[PDB]
Amino acid sequence: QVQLVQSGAEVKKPGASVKVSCKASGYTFTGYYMHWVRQAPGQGLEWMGWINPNSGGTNYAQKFQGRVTMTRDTSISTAYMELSRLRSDDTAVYYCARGGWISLYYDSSGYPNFDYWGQGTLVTVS
Amino acid sequence: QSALTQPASVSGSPGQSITISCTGTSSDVGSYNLVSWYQQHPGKAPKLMIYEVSKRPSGVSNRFSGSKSGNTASLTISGLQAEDEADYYCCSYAGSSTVIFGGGTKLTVL
Amino acid sequence: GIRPVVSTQLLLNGSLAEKEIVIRSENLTNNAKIIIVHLHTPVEIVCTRPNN
Ligand SMILES: *[C@@H]1O[C@H](CO)[C@@H](O[C@@H]2O[C@H](CO)[C@@H](O[C@@H]3O[C@H](CO[C@H]4O[C@H](CO[C@H]5O[C@H](CO)[C@@H](O)[C@H](O)[C@@H]5O)[C@@H](O)[C@H](O[C@H]5O[C@H](CO)[C@@H](O)[C@H](O)[C@@H]5O)[C@@H]4O)[C@@H](O)[C@H](O[C@H]4O[C@H](CO)[C@@H](O)[C@H](O)[C@@H]4O[C@H]4O[C@H](CO)[C@@H](O)[C@H](O)[C@@H]4O)[C@@H]3O)[C@H](O)[C@H]2NC(C)=O)[C@H](O)[C@H]1NC(C)=O
Numbered sequence: 001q002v003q004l005v006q007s008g009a010e011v012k013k014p015g016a017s018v019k020v021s022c023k024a025s026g027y028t029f030t031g032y033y034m035h036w037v038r039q040a041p042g043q044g045l046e047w048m049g050w051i052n053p054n055s056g057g058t059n060y061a062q063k064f065q066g067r068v069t070m071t072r073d074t075s076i077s078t079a080y081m082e083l084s085r086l087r088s089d090d091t092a093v094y095y096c097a098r099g100g101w102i103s104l105y106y107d108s109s110g111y112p113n114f115d116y117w118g119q120g121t122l123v124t125v126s
Numbered sequence: 127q128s129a130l131t132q133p134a135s136v137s138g139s140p141g142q143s144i145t146i147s148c149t150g151t152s153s154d155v156g157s158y159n160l161v162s163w164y165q166q167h168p169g170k171a172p173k174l175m176i177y178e179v180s181k182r183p184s185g186v187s188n189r190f191s192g193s194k195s196g197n198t199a200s201l202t203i204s205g206l207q208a209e210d211e212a213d214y215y216c217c218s219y220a221g222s223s224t225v226i227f228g229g230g231t232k233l234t235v236l
Numbered sequence: 237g238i239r240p241v242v243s244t245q246l247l248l249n250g251s252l253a254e255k256e257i258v259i260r261s262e263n264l265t266n267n268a269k270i271i272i273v274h275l276h277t278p279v280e281i282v283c284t285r286p287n288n
């Protein structure tokens with residue numbers, strides 16, 4: 001059917017930049033939004049911003065604006081995340097989720113309907 | 127601008143209904159009707175429960191229903207079994223195209 | 237009540253006809269006179285925008 005796979009686990013020192021990929025297959029990914037969320041071990045879920053894979057326009061939440069860069073590659077069907085200036089509080093697992101439908105006539109970006117999720121990438125900071 | 131309010135944990139006997147409720151700011155939940163529910167297994171990716179404040183997706187049986195009353199959104203679980211061991215989350219549209227998430231309720235069976 | 241709306245084509249809010257479509261024109265022979273059609277039943281139109 002359809003799958004959202006990610007890269008392997010990675011460990012970085014405080015002061016580096018981490019790259020997490022998300023590959024979507026089995027469906028036309030250029031017609032759906034893509035949301036990325038964070039989960040600290042033992043805590044709840046924190047929401048980082050979304051990416052629209054048609055025009056490349058991105059939004060980011062509070063407490064993240066300035067140290068996250070969200071790009072895309074249409075030809076190889078991957079979604080990228082560039083989080084620089086890592087700290088000790090960023091040890092978590094990162095998910096990529098498929099949001100609403102890109103509809104060209106209304107703003108369906110903020111609709112919280114994440115159907116299909118990635119298996120997660122374990123990023124820890126020591 | 128903080129997270130949505132949610133209790134620590136809930137419990138109930140099998141065959142007994144349980145209610146999990148979230149109370150939020152009127153700019154987040156009381157204005158827009160975009161609320162979704164999210165359980166997860168420990169060590170697994172979460173799965174989508176309820177689309178809007180009350181809607182059923184495909185592949186989910188008719189044991190979960192939702193409702194909204196002012197600033198409060200609640201989820202009703204009917205027929206509690208041993209497969210209800212999960213961690214439930216609230217999330218909603220929060221304005222300016224930002225989505226916020228709740229704390230988390232862990233349910234235990236008896 | 238005359239509402240002074242401003243529109244080029246597709247005459248917006250105003251008085252309808254009474255029993256059928258009525259066509260107003262000056263001569264209907266030369267092709268320089270603006271033929272005016274007065275409708276009997278309205279057709280709904282809605283328009284939107286993004287969020288500044
Ligand atoms: C002015 O007028 C214009 C009209 O031109 C208005 O624009 C229209 O606005 C409405 C919203 O009111 C939009 O409706 C929405 O459409 C999407 C898209 O659904 C279509 O595509 C689905 C995907 O399958 C195809 O597409 C992929 C592309 O990659 C292909 O690869 C596939 O092979 C398929 O070809 C498809 O499943 C849909 O089928 C459904 O509809 C047809 C109708 O013909 C039925 O037969 C089918 O049985 C089926 O029901 C359709 O073809 C929908 O997805 C939207 O529904 C979602 O959103 C709702 C609101 O959020 C929600 O309540 C629904 O439950 C549903 O929720 C879904 O959301 C996510 C989507 O994946 C997931 O999380 C999940 O699946 C969840 O279920 C909605 O119906 C119109 O598209 C839009 N028109 C155009 C041209 O864009 C405009 O609004 C007006 N302006 C005004 C009034 O101001």
Ligand SMILES: *[C@@H]1O[C@H](CO)[C@@H](O[C@@H]2O[C@H](CO)[C@@H](O[C@@H]3O[C@H](CO)[C@@H](O)[C@H](O)[C@@H]3O)[C@H](O)[C@H]2NC(C)=O)[C@H](O)[C@H]1NC(C)=O
Pocket residue numbers: 127153220221222223287288
């Ligand atoms: C469309 O754009 C407008 C731009 O103004 C958005 O309105 C803004 O929405 C945010 C939502 O968080 C408001 O912030 C809130 O402000 C109140 C003020 O007391 C504060 O108490 C809250 O804690 C929160 O910070 C913001 O004020 C508001 N802007 C104005 C001028 O009122 C609107 O949300 C956008 N629409 C959509 C659907 O996103």
Ligand SMILES: *[C@@H]1O[C@H](CO)[C@@H](O)[C@H](O)[C@H]1NC(C)=O
Pocket residue numbers: 263265266
């Ligand atoms: C306009 O109407 C008059 C009166 O019927 C007519 O004589 C004249 O020919 C018309 N104009 C044209 C261009 O046909």
